[PDB]
Amino acid sequence: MQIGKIIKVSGPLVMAENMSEASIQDMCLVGDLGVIGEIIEMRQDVASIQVYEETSGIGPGEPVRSTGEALSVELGPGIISQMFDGIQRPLDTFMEVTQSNFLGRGVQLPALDHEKQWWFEATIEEGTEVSAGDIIGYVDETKIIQHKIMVPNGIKGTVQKIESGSFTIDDPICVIETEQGLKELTMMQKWPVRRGRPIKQKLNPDVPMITGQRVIDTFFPVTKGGAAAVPGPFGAGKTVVQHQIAKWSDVDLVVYVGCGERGNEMTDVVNEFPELIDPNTGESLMERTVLIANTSNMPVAAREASIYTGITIAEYFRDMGYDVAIMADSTSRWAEALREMSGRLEEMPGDEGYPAYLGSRLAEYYERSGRVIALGSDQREGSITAISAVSPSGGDISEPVTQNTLRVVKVFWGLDSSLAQKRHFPSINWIQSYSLYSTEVGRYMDQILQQDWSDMVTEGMRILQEEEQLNEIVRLVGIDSLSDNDRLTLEVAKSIREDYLQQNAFDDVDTFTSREKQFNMLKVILTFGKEARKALSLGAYFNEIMEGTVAVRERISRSKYIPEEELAKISSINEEIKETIQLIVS
Amino acid sequence: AEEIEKTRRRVNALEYMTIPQLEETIYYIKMKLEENERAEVTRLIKVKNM
Amino acid sequence: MIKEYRTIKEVVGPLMAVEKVSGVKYEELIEVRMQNGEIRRGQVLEVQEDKAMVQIFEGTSGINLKNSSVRFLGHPLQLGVSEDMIGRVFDGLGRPKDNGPEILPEKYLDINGEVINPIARDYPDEFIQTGISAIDHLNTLVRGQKLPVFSGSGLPHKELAAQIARQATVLDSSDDFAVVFAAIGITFEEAEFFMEDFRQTGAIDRSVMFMNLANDPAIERIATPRMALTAAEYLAYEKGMHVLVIMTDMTNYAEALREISAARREVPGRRGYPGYLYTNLATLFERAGRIRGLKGSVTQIPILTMPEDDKTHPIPDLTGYITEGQIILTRELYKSGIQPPIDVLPSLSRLKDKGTGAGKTREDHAATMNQLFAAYAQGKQAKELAVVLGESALSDIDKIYAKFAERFENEYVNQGFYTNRTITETLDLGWELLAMLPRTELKRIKDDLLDKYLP
Amino acid sequence: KEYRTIKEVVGPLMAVEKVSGVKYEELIEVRMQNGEIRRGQVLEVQEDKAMVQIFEGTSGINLKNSSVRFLGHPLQLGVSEDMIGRVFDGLGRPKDNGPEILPEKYLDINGEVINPIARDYPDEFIQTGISAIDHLNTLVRGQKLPVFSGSGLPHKELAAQIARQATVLDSSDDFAVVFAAIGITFEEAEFFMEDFRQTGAIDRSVMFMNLANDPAIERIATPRMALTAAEYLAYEKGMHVLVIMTDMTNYAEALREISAARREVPGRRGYPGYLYTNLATLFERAGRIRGLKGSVTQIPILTMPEDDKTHPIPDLTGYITEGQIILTRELYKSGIQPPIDVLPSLSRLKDKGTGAGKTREDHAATMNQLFAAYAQGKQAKELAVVLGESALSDIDKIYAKFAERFENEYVNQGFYTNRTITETLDLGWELLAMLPRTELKRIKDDLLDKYLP
Numbered sequence A: 001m002q003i004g005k006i007i008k009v010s011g012p013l014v015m016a017e018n019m020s021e022a023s024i025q026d027m028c029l030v031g032d033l034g035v036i037g038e039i040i041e042m043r044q045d046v047a048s049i050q051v052y053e054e055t056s057g058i059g060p061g062e063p064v065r066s067t068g069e070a071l072s073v074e075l076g077p078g079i080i081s082q083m084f085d086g087i088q089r090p091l092d093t094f095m096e097v098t099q100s101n102f103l104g105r106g107v108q109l110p111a112l113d114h115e116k117q118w119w120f121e122a123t124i125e126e127g128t129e130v131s132a133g134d135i136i137g138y139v140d141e142t143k144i145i146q147h148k149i150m151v152p153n154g155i156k157g158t159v160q161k162i163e164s165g166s167f168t169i170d171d172p173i174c175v176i177e178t179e180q181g182l183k184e185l186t187m188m189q190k191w192p193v194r195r196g197r198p199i200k201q202k203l204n205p206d207v208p209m210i211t212g213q214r215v216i217d218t219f220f221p222v223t224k225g226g227a228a229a230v231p232g233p234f235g236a237g238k239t240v241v242q243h244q245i246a247k248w249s250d251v252d253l254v255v256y257v258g259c260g261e262r263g264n265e266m267t268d269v270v271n272e273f274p275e276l277i278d279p280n281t282g283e284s285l286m287e288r289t290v291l292i293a294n295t296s297n298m299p300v301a302a303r304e305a306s307i308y309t310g311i312t313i314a315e316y317f318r319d320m321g322y323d324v325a326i327m328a329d330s331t332s333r334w335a336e337a338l339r340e341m342s343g344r345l346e347e348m349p350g351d352e353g354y355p356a357y358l359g360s361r362l363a364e365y366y367e368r369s370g371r372v373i374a375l376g377s378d379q380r381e382g383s384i385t386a387i388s389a390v391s392p393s394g395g396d397i398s399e400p401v402t403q404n405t406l407r408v409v410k411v412f413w414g415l416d417s418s419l420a421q422k423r424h425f426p427s428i429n430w431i432q433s434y435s436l437y438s439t440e441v442g443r444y445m446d447q448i449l450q451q452d453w454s455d456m457v458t459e460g461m462r463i464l465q466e467e468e469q470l471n472e473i474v475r476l477v478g479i480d481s482l483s484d485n486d487r488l489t490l491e492v493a494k495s496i497r498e499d500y501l502q503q504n505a506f507d508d509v510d511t512f513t514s515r516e517k518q519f520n521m522l523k524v525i526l527t528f529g530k531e532a533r534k535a536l537s538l539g540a541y542f543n544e545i546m547e548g549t550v551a552v553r554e555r556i557s558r559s560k561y562i563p564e565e566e567l568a569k570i571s572s573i574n575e576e577i578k579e580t581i582q583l584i585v586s
Numbered sequence B: 001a002e003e004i005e006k007t008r009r010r011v012n013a014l015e016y017m018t019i020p021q022l023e024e025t026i027y028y029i030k031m032k033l034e035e036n037e038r039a040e041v042t043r044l045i046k047v048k049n050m
Numbered sequence C: 001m002i003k004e005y006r007t008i009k010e011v012v013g014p015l016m017a018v019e020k021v022s023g024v025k026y027e028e029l030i031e032v033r034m035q036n037g038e039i040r041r042g043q044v045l046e047v048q049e050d051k052a053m054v055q056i057f058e059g060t061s062g063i064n065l066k067n068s069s070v071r072f073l074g075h076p077l078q079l080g081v082s083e084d085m086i087g088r089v090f091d092g093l094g095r096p097k098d099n100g101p102e103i104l105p106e107k108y109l110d111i112n113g114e115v116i117n118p119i120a121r122d123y124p125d126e127f128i129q130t131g132i133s134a135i136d137h138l139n140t141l142v143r144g145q146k147l148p149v150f151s152g153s154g155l156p157h158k159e160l161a162a163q164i165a166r167q168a169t170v171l172d173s174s175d176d177f178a179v180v181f182a183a184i185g186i187t188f189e190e191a192e193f194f195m196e197d198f199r200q201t202g203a204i205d206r207s208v209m210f211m212n213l214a215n216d217p218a219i220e221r222i223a224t225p226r227m228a229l230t231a232a233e234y235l236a237y238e239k240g241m242h243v244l245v246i247m248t249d250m251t252n253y254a255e256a257l258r259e260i261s262a263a264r265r266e267v268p269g270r271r272g273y274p275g276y277l278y279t280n281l282a283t284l285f286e287r288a289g290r291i292r293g294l295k296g297s298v299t300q301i302p303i304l305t306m307p308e309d310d311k312t313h314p315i316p317d318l319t320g321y322i323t324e325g326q327i328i329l330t331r332e333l334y335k336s337g338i339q340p341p342i343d344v345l346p347s348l349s350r351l352k353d354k355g356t357g358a359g360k361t362r363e364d365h366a367a368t369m370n371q372l373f374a375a376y377a378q379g380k381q382a383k384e385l386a387v388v389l390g391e392s393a394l395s396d397i398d399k400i401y402a403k404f405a406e407r408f409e410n411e412y413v414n415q416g417f418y419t420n421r422t423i424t425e426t427l428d429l430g431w432e433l434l435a436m437l438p439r440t441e442l443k444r445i446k447d448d449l450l451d452k453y454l455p
Numbered sequence D: 001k002e003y004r005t006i007k008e009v010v011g012p013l014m015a016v017e018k019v020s021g022v023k024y025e026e027l028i029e030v031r032m033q034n035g036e037i038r039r040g041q042v043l044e045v046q047e048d049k050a051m052v053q054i055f056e057g058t059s060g061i062n063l064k065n066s067s068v069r070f071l072g073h074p075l076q077l078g079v080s081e082d083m084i085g086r087v088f089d090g091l092g093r094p095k096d097n098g099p100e101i102l103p104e105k106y107l108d109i110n111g112e113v114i115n116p117i118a119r120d121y122p123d124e125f126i127q128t129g130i131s132a133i134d135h136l137n138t139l140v141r142g143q144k145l146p147v148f149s150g151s152g153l154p155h156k157e158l159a160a161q162i163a164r165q166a167t168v169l170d171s172s173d174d175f176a177v178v179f180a181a182i183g184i185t186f187e188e189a190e191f192f193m194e195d196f197r198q199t200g201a202i203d204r205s206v207m208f209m210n211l212a213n214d215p216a217i218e219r220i221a222t223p224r225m226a227l228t229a230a231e232y233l234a235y236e237k238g239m240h241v242l243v244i245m246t247d248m249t250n251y252a253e254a255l256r257e258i259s260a261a262r263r264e265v266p267g268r269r270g271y272p273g274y275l276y277t278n279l280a281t282l283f284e285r286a287g288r289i290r291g292l293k294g295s296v297t298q299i300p301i302l303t304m305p306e307d308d309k310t311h312p313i314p315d316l317t318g319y320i321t322e323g324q325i326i327l328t329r330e331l332y333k334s335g336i337q338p339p340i341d342v343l344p345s346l347s348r349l350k351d352k353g354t355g356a357g358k359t360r361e362d363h364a365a366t367m368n369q370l371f372a373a374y375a376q377g378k379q380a381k382e383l384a385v386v387l388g389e390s391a392l393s394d395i396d397k398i399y400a401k402f403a404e405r406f407e408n409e410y411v412n413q414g415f416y417t418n419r420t421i422t423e424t425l426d427l428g429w430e431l432l433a434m435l436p437r438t439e440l441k442r443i444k445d446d447l448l449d450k451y452l453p
Ligand SMILES: Nc1ncnc2c1ncn2[C@@H]1O[C@H](COP(=O)(O)OP(=O)(O)O)[C@@H](O)[C@H]1O
Pocket: A232, A233, A234, A235, A236, A237, A238, A239, A240, A241, A425, A426, A427, A503, A504, A505, A506, C349, C350, C351, C352, C353
């Protein structure tokens, strides 16, 4: 019980003496209000504290008491369908405890309902020599997902007692006989956020994810446990994309982390996600998602916390064996948060003022994801997919954040203002965007669908690649000038980017396109792509065929809008384009 | 004869407008980052001398 | 009690060092009283041990250190709020400038305010008719939204604001906006424009204004937009009013921050601006929206002049990343005699989705704008090729778009600053302009939707 | 001698007081109150105190109840004959779960500068199995040939492909391949280790692995370890060694981090003022030596930020290394594997490993012919798409048909397809055979009809 004393206050930085007993990166309570802060460095007796709340009205002389523990998150029942703060505080409960529409100060609150009854079905038998990570029972938190209680690390012994029944996360649900003494366990375990949760070993992500977005699922795919980055200027649709992925992903759990970005974007999510319903869960999406909200006008130090808390919760459900996806929006805000604290500490800055340890700190975040096998010997596989939103200033991707991200990721969806200008949504630049998981995703998918998908996506990209090289001359020579057969290439790539790539997320059917339906559109266009070549080989003038297109091209323009169940429509329109140059060649 | 004029226009428009606008722009762009680079270097020395 | 010290250590520019003090807090409002008797307000920037650094708003001219004292008011910089504020105009620090009667203030509110709890914050979906078609239809504005204007020096942004301010009314209601205007470092002529315009639209009786002109101290600009936003959230939440927030120039605000930052020898970010610019700006713009249970609303339309006419400059960059879209002005359009000169392509609204559709507008509202975008994007680019390679170098369909692109600018964008277009007229005109294209080219509008609304 | 005198902790930096006999860059380790043990290094030492940077971070340390020990030695490496086959970390510790080696001796990883008069220049040709590298930009022993890539250009496949296929010819000397990995994602690390295991190259190579999340201070030591190990295999064991390092861009990013730690002001583009020299210290340590039968050859790989050579990382590298192998985005997006573009690519000492005694007698003569014909074919191609196919003289049309056939069949072999030197040379003839006998003005009357189909 060593009570420290403040000797300096400068914005988010509080210097306090009499803290020699405390340790680095311990949490504190600062001032008479007891606002939540954290020691960042210690010079002799005096400790330096960054505060996760506004310090308006705090002065020297006021007390500071350490807590002895680092920043940690509690992992147990009641964690799903809840929007938390960067330091994990239930905003709904916060509103119910503070009785205001605003965020108060110095108001502590336990992140989970310790006064709630949860039925716990024990699924392990007594007298079992368990180790760290082993499951002892599950609690059906949602109708779709069960909360498997695991053995906290550092604990191996033999189970003494265990039974089904209604408890809270406070009262003991089990007892293990460890060598260091008798240890009893509960449904809740707490873990430091800046410490990677241990694993047996780690796997290569093989299984492709279902985004529903035709652009990325086809040409630039991300596997389950892969690292994807979405760099782009404001208005490109970085948040929209991450919302679209969160809605229709084939994963089992999602952690949407919103740090340093708009508040309405989060209230939008809690207003709608309870009302949206989509498989693989028969129930709502809130029974699958976990929100960590940090608005731009929230305390700056709390931004780094929000990232490290959202990934720890992800690692938690990863250890169960579930496939989880974490959306960081935006990762640039984390860096800009670090830039302030680096400046306020008068540290020697790196590129663009960012700390020189930015590249290393980002690597730690991404090397804490991916498909792995959990601890124990049950050997469940769990994957963490990272969908990071990078927001480079001016749109220049040569910034430190985008650069250090593209060094430790395998997937990059470069957005550009030029396409968002044309309202080409989603605005992913197909020429530069790239996925190193391309070849392996293609293998998986040509097996599953049993169609020549690998051959189709590669040539579909070539018609795009050719489209780019062929407008380079249109400026110079003109449209009718030469390479007349290449005009067909331009008017089928025109359909590629306008009928297949342009995926509006607003319409009630093209919000999501299933893989099987996603096949037909791709299929229809390159059939025609060669069916055109079939007519220009015989000698039928291209203007004639283009009229034949226009008659049937209107149909494929609509092909986005036809429902999933009736795919035959997109299968039969293919037969109609097999027909035309039989009736238009003679 | 008609196409000569079209091609002549393109050559002229490319030589007089396009290319010089490119050259003069990359120079003004080069000068900007030249100044920005050392404008930061001086500031860094101030950070160094704190 | 009263708390006053006569021990001023240093006076350097806007900053002042007071030592041998005790019990001083961060951001505490202070008052310097000089040897002559003059009172100058100030704010605590940093307090360590028995020392404290303070920023002086009114400046530090003619101060004698030894014979001057510093009073510590024991509270942060706060505004005296009231219902009587409506119809009144205050200075940069909320002091009466209109010669009106002494106000009996209701409460004293810390101008920093508090962050709206997301759970309590409910989404803005109420479409606002602004009278301007480029805004109403193509880049929609709703109430509770933070939609700024990106302009430049010489460009007519004050006219666009004044037009919106009086042509602002929401459908399905008789709710008249009670606007609040924050003048930041602007000139007399630029201020008198808003002022005079309010007097003959009668909105001066329905508004409260905060004046900080070019002859007014730059340090007051730090507080001014917070005085406005606090009065905005007071009238809108406690008194359930519908408030429209206008702030200009927003650029002059960031200039003021850099003045103090450079004075404090802080580690400078881009262009010398503070590293905490994004955060400070956010603490202004985020202070808008609607909340559960409360009928009132606070909608925000800031105005900033882009330096160098450069979108990538820190001030317009950071603002664009915070706010829910932006409205952009261009000299190219302004020189073309387009009123208002709104370049619709780089502009954006982030709440146009849930904002418009069936029930609030016609159902074609979503398909028309997306079609006009793709058409103008192709048409304008074709026009570029036309003026350099000749009109006879385009295809027949290119000239159709090029002709469309020009007609788009001259009538749809250009409507005059004193003409009010209802949302219906705009939509009707929308089809008329895109009518001159083949149906086969428009692959972005429902075919059943086409036939019904196609002319 | 454990000191319990910790005065300051700022960032990763830590201050120890009341000490003596402490040296610069001396290795330290700190015993915490909980018992956790972390390593460190003296970044600065004054008369009665010293500054140290902890590798494993500074989280959760109580200054009063923690202690520091000075080990009295810099970063050293355990040298042993039984080293080949095993995988190590950036510091030299085993990662392969094998029998911990007993080193012959410990050596400073910095090494020493080799006497200019002692240097013996390289002549022996080295086969890498890749046509674009083994014929047009031929690798010679003791050379320093880098590889310029970008984020996502398959520079990791090529890196694996080289060491697998890299082999000395005839020479009765065994072949060592000291591979070094710098700040790479696990997948990339797992990729390389697995790929070396299955190909049996693991038993023919030494591996130094360094993940991205690994501390920055050892990211900088990773190459110095490998080079010291490579120098231990060549100069004191008489073996021909080939060194591969990836990534080199990651090395600089980590080099920048410890500079800001020393509060040193960056020189250019955010990179420190000794970048060129620091690169030369670990680059220029390669080549033969007079009297000794050793050989050290480096193939450093780096990703140019946004495909730019003028960037400090590949630009400064050019002033040190002889030549460059550049991968092109346009090629990789066209399905070319490896996506090597031979025009900007270069090898300054290529002719030293060509000709009879090292390769076929037409090596140099052919090389320039394929090269000049490629450029001409590319220029025929660019004029074709602007003026139509017919505007071309039909032998400029065959130069165009040559130039794409050249990329698709010669350049593109596959990341797992080995090509011996002889198979590559007559392959050029098979492609040159497309062209008539009239244009080939770089080849003489002995060789043109001795090899042409
Ligand atoms: N895929 C998309 N489909 C349709 N509209 C989009 C799409 N992406 C973005 N938009 C439009 O652009 C706006 C910007 O969205 P947001 O994701 O917030 O941009 P960013 O994240 O880049 O700041 C949205 O309000 C939306 O109207």
